[PDB]
Design a protein around this ligand. Sequence first.
Ligand SMILES: CCCSc1cc(C(=O)O)c(O)c(I)c1-n1cccc1
Ligand SMILES: [Zn+2]
Length: 196
Amino acid sequence: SVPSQKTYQGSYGFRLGFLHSGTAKSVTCTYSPALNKLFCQLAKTCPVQLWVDSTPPPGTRVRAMAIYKQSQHMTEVVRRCPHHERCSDSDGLAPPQHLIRVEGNLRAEYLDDRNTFRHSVVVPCEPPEVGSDCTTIHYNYMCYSSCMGGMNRRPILTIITLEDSSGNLLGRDSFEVRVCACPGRDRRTEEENLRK
Ligand SMILES: CCCSc1cc(C(=O)O)c(O)c(I)c1-n1cccc1
Ligand SMILES: [Zn+2]
């Protein structure tokens, strides 16, 4: 099967937000609204904002999962490549096979789905800190888009779901991801291609 990617704000008005990091050669993570695409370096912090119109109940959680964007690959589980799954870069919580990690949250849970074999990482929802209007999760992507035997140059989407305590769907958003050495240059190139 294939997870849904349909945007769904739901009862709480759930949606993502991204910082405006620019496209300088030194940028490590940058988001293109025109492409709905995040460009990031390997294993670097990717801040993703969560926004709601109203407060969800205690026990609500936020899950992240990657799928291949192209239909002919969408049934294949997105996983780390044969090199990176063996490079012993564990943080003590993420299984070495998982592409997406959450940084700096000891309550993150990593799921290997018993039926679909897909990987995901889920955290409890926490309200914004005093003085802030949104909550930020820091993700890391642990393989390059180009990794042979893994993503192998195939584009991926990240699907972010807001879920109740049973795992039922409350909201959904998504974005394409390219993990690459020079995200600023690649964002500029792809935005230019889109304009042309
Ligand atoms: C379940 C505990 C509360 S979760 C929550 C509350 C508020 C709020 O304003 O009260 C908010 O703005 C956000 I963004 C979140 N939130 C955190 C992750 C996803 C949504
Ligand atoms: Zn890899």
